[PDB]
Amino acid sequence: MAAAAVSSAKRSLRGELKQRLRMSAEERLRQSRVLSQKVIAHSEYQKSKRISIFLSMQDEIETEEIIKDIFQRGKICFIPRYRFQSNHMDMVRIESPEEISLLPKTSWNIPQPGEGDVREEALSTGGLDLIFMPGLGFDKHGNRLGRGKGYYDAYLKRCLQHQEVKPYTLALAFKEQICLQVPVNDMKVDEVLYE
Ligand SMILES: [Mg+2]
Ligand SMILES: [Mg+2]
Ligand SMILES: [Mg+2]
Ligand code: NI
Numbered sequence: 001m002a003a004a005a006v007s008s009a010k011r012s013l014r015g016e017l018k019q020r021l022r023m024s025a026e027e028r029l030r031q032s033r034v035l036s037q038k039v040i041a042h043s044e045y046q047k048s049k050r051i052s053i054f055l056s057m058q059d060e061i062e063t064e065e066i067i068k069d070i071f072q073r074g075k076i077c078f079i080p081r082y083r084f085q086s087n088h089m090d091m092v093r094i095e096s097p098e099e100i101s102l103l104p105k106t107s108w109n110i111p112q113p114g115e116g117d118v119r120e121e122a123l124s125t126g127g128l129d130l131i132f133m134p135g136l137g138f139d140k141h142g143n144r145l146g147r148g149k150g151y152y153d154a155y156l157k158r159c160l161q162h163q164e165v166k167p168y169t170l171a172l173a174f175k176e177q178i179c180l181q182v183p184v185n186d187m188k189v190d191e192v193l194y195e
Contacts, residue, residue: 010148013183014136017137020176022058031175035193036063042193045170050128050129052091052122053077053132055080055100055111059136060172061172061173063172079100080112080151090122091131091155092112123162127162127163131156131167139179139181145179152187168191169187169189172194177194178192
C-alpha cells in the first residue's frame with residue numbers, strides 16, 4: 001500500500017522522463033561528448049583499474065568513447081550480462097572494443113555474451129573498482145531511478161559482500177535525466193555527472 005504509492009510515483013516519473021528523453025540524436029551525442037571528457041579527467045576513473053560499464057541504449061549517454069579510453073589505459077573492462085527470468089546479472093569481462101560488435105544481442109537489442117559463452121565474472125577475480133551506473137533519472141541528492149527490474153540494486157549488494165571496500169558508483173546522465181526528487185525505497189550512487 002505504501003509501496004504502491006511509491007511505485008506509482010516511480011512509474012509516473014519514468015513516463016515523463018521517457019517523454020523528455022525520446023532529444024535529437026545530435027544533442028544526445030553532444031552531451032555524451034561532454035560527459036566523456038568529464039569522465040576521462042575524473043579522479044576515480046583515472047585511479048580505478050577494474051571497471052564495469054554499460055552499452056548505451058538510445059535513451060542513455062553514449063559510453064562508446066569512454067570504453068575506447070578504458071582499453072587504451074590497460075584497464076580491465078567489464079559489461080553487464082543480465083538474465084530475463086529474474087533480477088540477476090553478472091559483470092563479464094570483454095577483451096577489446098571490437099568484441100562488442102560480434103556479441104549477440106537481447107530483446108532490448110543490448111549486446112552481451114550468450115549462454116555457452118564462459119566469461120570471466122568480475123566478482124570471481126576481485127570485484128570492481130568503479131561501476132558506471134545507468135538509469136532513467138537521478139536527483140542531486142544521489143538517488144537513482146532504475147528501469148524497475150532491480151538489476152543494479154541487487155548487484156551492488158553482491159559487491160558489498162565480495163569486496164572489502166565498496167565500488168565507486170558513477171552515474172552518467174543527461175541534463176534531461178536530472179530530477180528534483182526521485183521516489184526511493186534502495187541504493188544511492190556516489191556521484192552523478194551531467195551538464
Ligand atoms: Mg560479477
Ligand atoms: Mg522532477
Ligand atoms: Mg530535496
Ligand atoms: Ni550469473
